[PDB]
Amino acid sequence: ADDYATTRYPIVLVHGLTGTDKYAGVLEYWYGIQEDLQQHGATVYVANLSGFQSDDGPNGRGEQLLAYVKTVLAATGATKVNLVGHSQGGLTSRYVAAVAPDLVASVTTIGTPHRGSEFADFVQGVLAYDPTGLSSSVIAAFVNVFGILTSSSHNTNQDALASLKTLTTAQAATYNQNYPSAGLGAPGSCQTGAPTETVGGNTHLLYSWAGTAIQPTLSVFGVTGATDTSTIPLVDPANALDPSTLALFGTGTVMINRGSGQNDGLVSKCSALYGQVLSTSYKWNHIDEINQLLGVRGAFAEDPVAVIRTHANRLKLAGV
C-alpha cells in the first residue's frame, strides 16, 4: 500500500443509470475500485443516488449529490472534492460543479453521455409509438421497482421515465444549454472543449475517457454491421461469464444503425468527449468501464482499475 493515488481533495465516485453504491447491499457498483484506490492512499467516497432520475430538478440526482458532497466535506475537513462520474454520473457531477463550484476541484467523466444516447432515443421513440401510454406505465413501473429493490438504502425516489428523457440526445442538448461548460466542444463537432474552466472564480480541472469496444464494419442493404473488439470473436470468456458483454454488443449495433459511430454499447465516442480527453481507444463496453460484471472483461480490454488508479495519480500531480 502506498500514496500513488493520494490526492489533495477527496475523490467522490458518482454512479450512473440503474446505480447505487452497492446493488442490493451486496455488489459494489464500482467493483474493486474503492479498495484499489484506498490501497494507493486515496480518500474515496461512493455516492448513493437515485438510479432513475433526472440530474437537475428538486428531486434530481444533482441535488442528492450536492447534499452528499457537503457531508463528505464536513467529515473529511476538506474544502473541495474531485468528482469522478460514470455514465449519467458525469452529468450529475457537471450539475454540482455548476451550482456549487466552490466545492469542486475537478470533474472526470467516464463513458458519460454528454450528448445523450441514441439507445435512449430508440427506447423513448418506441414508447411514444403506443398512444395509450400503457407500455410506458408498465415498463417504467418495473424499472422503478428494480431501482427500489436494488438501491442499498431502498431509495424510493425512482423515476425511469424521467431518467429516460434525460438521456435522450435532444434532452442532453437542452441540458448543455442550461448547464454549459467550457469542457464541451460545439454540438456536432465530435471534438472536446477546454481542459479547465473557472466557474464563479473557482478553477476546475476537466477530464474524460470513453470506451469504444463496439466498432462499425460493413453496410449491406442499408444495415451496418458491428464487431465487439473487446473480445476474442465468439469464444471470449467474457461472452460466457458476463451477460452484459453480448447484450452491449447488441445495443451498440443498434446505436451504430442510428448513426452513433463507435461506442461502448450505450454511449458514443462523440457523446463522451469532455475536457481533457485522456483516451477513446479502450476496447471497453459501458460496464467494463466500472470493472463489471465482477471484473470480467474481454481479452483485449485494458484493466479499468489500473486506468482509474493512474488517473488518481494524475490528479495528485495536477495539484488536486
Residues identified as active-site: 87, 264, 286
Residue type, 197: E
Closer residue to Ca ion (CB): 197 or 242: 242
- Which span sits near Ca ion by CB under 5 A: 60-68, 93-101, 207-215, 280-288? 280-288
Q: Is 236 in the site for Ca ion (CB under 5 A)?
A: no
Handedness of CA 108, 54, 255, 235 (dihedral sign): positive
Minimum distance between the CB of residue 230 and Ca ion, rounded to whole angstroms? Answer: 8
Query: Is 104 or 296 the residue whose CB approaches Ca ion more closely?
Result: 296
Distances (CA, A) of 81 to 10, 37, 59: 5, 15, 22
User: Closest CB to Ca ion among 42 and 248?
Assistant: 248
Question: Looking at 63, 159, 288, 289, which residue binds Ca ion (CB under 5 A)?
Answer: 288
Does 130 count as an annotated binding residue? no
Which of 270, 252, 169 is closest to 215 using CA atoms?
252
Site size toward Ca ion (CB under 5 A) is 4
Q: Residue 204: helix, strand or coil by DSSP? A: strand
The answer to the question of whether 288 is labelled as a binding residue is yes
DSSP letter for each residue of 56-104? SSTTSHHHHHHHHHHHHHHHH--S-EEEEEETHHHHHHHHHHHHSGGGE
| Backbone dihedral region for residue 261 (phi beyond 0: left; psi -120 to 50: alpha; all else: beta) | left
- C-alpha separations of 109 from 32, 88, 282 in Å: 18, 9, 14
296 is in an annotated binding site: yes
CB of 101 within 8 A of CB of 202? yes
Q: How far is the CB of 31 from Ca ion (least distance, A)?
A: 10
Which of 55, 118, 236, 242 touches Ca ion (CB under 5 A)?
A: 242
Least distance between Ca ion and beta carbon 30 (Å): 14
Nearer to Ca ion, 214 or 296 (CB): 296
297 lies in the site for Ca ion, by CB under 5 A: yes
- Quote the Cα angle for 269-275-280, to 5°: 30
Select 56 or 242, whichever has its Cβ closest to Ca ion: 242
Report the site for Ca ion in 154-193 (rule: CB under 5 A): none
3 state SS of 182: coil
Encoded one letter per residue, x for contact with Ca ion by CB under 5 A and - for no contact, window 7-46 reads ----------------------------------------
CB of 295 to Ca ion, least distance (A): 8
Q: Give me the residues that bind Ca ion (CB under 5 A), please.
A: 242, 288, 296-297
Binding site: residue ranges?
242, 288, 292, 296
